[PDB]
Write an enzyme that holds these catalytic residues in place. Structure first.
Site, mmCIF file in Angstrom:
data_model
loop_
_atom_site.group_PDB
_atom_site.id
_atom_site.type_symbol
_atom_site.label_atom_id
_atom_site.label_comp_id
_atom_site.label_asym_id
_atom_site.label_seq_id
_atom_site.Cartn_x
_atom_site.Cartn_y
_atom_site.Cartn_z
ATOM 1 N N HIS A 152 -16.019 -0.782 33.866
ATOM 2 C CA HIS A 152 -15.763 -2.236 33.911
ATOM 3 C C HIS A 152 -15.306 -2.815 32.555
ATOM 4 O O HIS A 152 -14.918 -3.978 32.509
ATOM 5 C CB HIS A 152 -16.890 -3.068 34.525
ATOM 6 C CG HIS A 152 -18.183 -3.081 33.769
ATOM 7 N ND1 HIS A 152 -19.312 -2.458 34.274
ATOM 8 C CD2 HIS A 152 -18.502 -3.683 32.599
ATOM 9 C CE1 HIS A 152 -20.270 -2.671 33.387
ATOM 10 N NE2 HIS A 152 -19.836 -3.402 32.364
ATOM 11 N N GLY A 168 -23.888 -7.252 26.488
ATOM 12 C CA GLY A 168 -23.520 -6.368 25.403
ATOM 13 C C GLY A 168 -24.225 -5.025 25.482
ATOM 14 O O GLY A 168 -23.870 -4.133 24.727
ATOM 15 N N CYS A 223 -24.301 -2.919 28.148
ATOM 16 C CA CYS A 223 -23.625 -1.896 28.993
ATOM 17 C C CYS A 223 -23.185 -0.710 28.162
ATOM 18 O O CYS A 223 -22.768 -0.887 27.009
ATOM 19 C CB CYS A 223 -22.447 -2.498 29.748
ATOM 20 S SG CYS A 223 -22.885 -3.956 30.697
#
Ligand SMILES: Cc1ccncc1NC(=O)Cc1cc(Cl)cc(N[C@H]2C[C@H]2C(F)(F)F)c1
Ligand SMILES: Cc1ccncc1NC(=O)Cc1cc(Cl)cc(N[C@H]2C[C@H]2C(F)(F)F)c1
Lengths: 304, 304
Positions: free
Chosen positions: A41, A143, A145
């Site tokens: 993503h 932040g 991920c």
């Protein structure tokens, strides 16, 4: 003595943390050999997340669109590919700090350490379990991920998790290091159900053995039980079925304390039925199911 | 979202862990610059621990009696001295992995991460607090002496604790990195009292702010209170006095949630008086006092 929620030392995994940036999206990457792994993503925008066709979005991106950074130095992306929900960016330099590693897909009920990271930098380490419904209860913000879950087997790091998302329900969801999500979740901005969660019975029993080892024996009763009668109660209190395999796994804790597994299942049977009456077990006023029998053995025997 | 007992990344401290051996006694050392720090009871035998005169026992030992080992390689002790309850062994090589560090004596109520080690090798990391009675509730076994407590301030490691002993009462006791014990404990095999422990009120309130931040607001009531009326209740339930300084420290959490500190003190006043009625706060069925207001700010804001 003492029994704490203890994480593996994070050092070998900190040397693998880099910052990945595609356009305005900045998240964490895992740098092993000449490959930097991150959630796919990263290629998306706010509008793209609603229903992304990742195949199309990736085609629109070339290697030069990905900025991989290992501290104050930049790396060169010389290849890009999509393995399920992870991005595999082939960098020109191979991590000098790569430790001996493995990629394992963990079973529900098992635990691992998470190194929570922001902008490629580690903030903290904590232990959590893969719940029976393949969700995890970590501590992740915007932040985070690309932060990874891992276990250490002496000197070999087994990467098991990569954080992808927090659903509107507060559930943390992610993939194994092959981009295969745990459970039925998808990397799409849509309402997603996790499913009925259950208690990890072998884990509660393992933590009751840790309590006995640590001097908390109040709950031990002059009562015993059978696997069938115990599982009839476990069913009622929404606990995972206990197998003879779980009894075998509990064996080291049974040997250390001298309490047979069925005698412990009888104490746990009373604990479910009577409650604990305000009383605490290892400083908790509830039953703890996020310690594996292996985590108890490791902590109580000094495995390094 | 999510709120966990999170430790600092242990990497910078793992590179400081060595194995110290004097005679048959093997424990952990902290290698910073050309000095390896360890608990002085390393010079003792089973008989010496009852009432050791460390001055005499150290005179009987020369540098060559200390074996410092940093992994599979050995270091050379070219000096030895006693600073209170720590042994300062001057080694011939200076740690190449020494990070930016400080030595701080922590205040009671403050938290730190412990890197639990056995035979100079790290086993796990966990967070704990220095209780108001200067004891800690860690997880230590035989071989864990010399394990250190620490905080990280961006890239600077502040060493605050070194594990010395577990008393017959299960209390963990140790020193700051200058060998000054926390509390009234001595490195002698004798029965030692810890003193009346109290709850860290500013910490419980900080964790109630973390719960509000994480969606648990059930305990917030249409009630308010004064510092004096609150401290009258806190006294009753054996809680540390709350100062306006603690209110100021709680300010960032008050700003983030919009709930004034006295409105939170009123929710906590009811929580003490009514109990919590089986209900949970952040997955706990009791009040948690081992998170500092600073640990809440750090975890909820993504400080790395
Ligand atoms: C924010 C966060 C917190 C904890 N753990 C993980 C995360 N991040 C995510 O969940 C990433 C994510 C995934 C999905 Cl499928 C959609 C989005 N959409 C867009 C709206 C923007 C957002 F970041 F503010 F949420 C984001
Ligand atoms: C064993 C341990 C466990 C956890 N944390 C720390 C420790 N270790 C200690 O406390 C060290 C200690 C200190 C004092 Cl002053 C006396 C002794 N005496 C002799 C008897 C032998 C022992 F190790 F078996 F205890 C030991």
């Amino acid at each position: 003595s003492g029994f704490r929620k203890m994480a593996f030392p994070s050092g070998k995994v900190e040397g693998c943390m880099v910052q990945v940036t595609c356009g305005t999206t900045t998240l964490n990457g895992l740098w092993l050999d000449d490959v930097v792994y991150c959630p796919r993503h990263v290629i998306c925008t706010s509008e793209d997340m609603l229903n992304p066709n990742y195949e199309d979005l990736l085609i629109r991106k070339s290697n030069h669109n990905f900025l991989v950074q290992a501290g104050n130095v930049q790396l060169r992306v010389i290849g890009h590919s999509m393995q399920n929900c992870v991005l595999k960016l082939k960098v020109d330099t191979a991590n000098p700090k790569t430790p001996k590693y493995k990629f394992v897909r963990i079973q529900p009920g098992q635990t691992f350490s998470v190194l929570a990271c922001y902008n490629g930098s580690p903030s903290g380490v904590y232990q959590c379990a893969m719940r029976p419904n393949f969700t995890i209860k970590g501590s992740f913000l915007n932040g985070s991920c690309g932060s990874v879950g891992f276990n250490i087997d002496y000197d070999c790091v087994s990467f098991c998790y990569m954080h992808h998302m927090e659903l509107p329900t507060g559930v943390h969801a992610g993939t194994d290091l092959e981009g295969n999500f745990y459970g039925p979740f998808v990397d799409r901005q849509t309402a997603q159900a996790a499913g009925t969660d259950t208690t990890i019975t072998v884990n509660v029993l393992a933590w009751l053995y840790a309590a006995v080892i640590n001097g908390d024996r109040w709950f031990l009763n002059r009562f015993t039980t059978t696997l069938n009668d115990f599982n009839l109660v476990a069913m009622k209190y929404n606990y995972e079925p206990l197998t003879q395999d779980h009894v075998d796994i509990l064996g080291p804790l049974s040997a250390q304390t001298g309490i047979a597994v069925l005698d412990m299942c009888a104490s746990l049977k009373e604990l479910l039925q009577n409650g604990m009456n305000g009383r605490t077990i290892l400083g908790s006023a509830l039953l703890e199911d996020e310690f594996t029998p292996f985590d108890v053995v490791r902590q109580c025997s000094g495995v390094t």
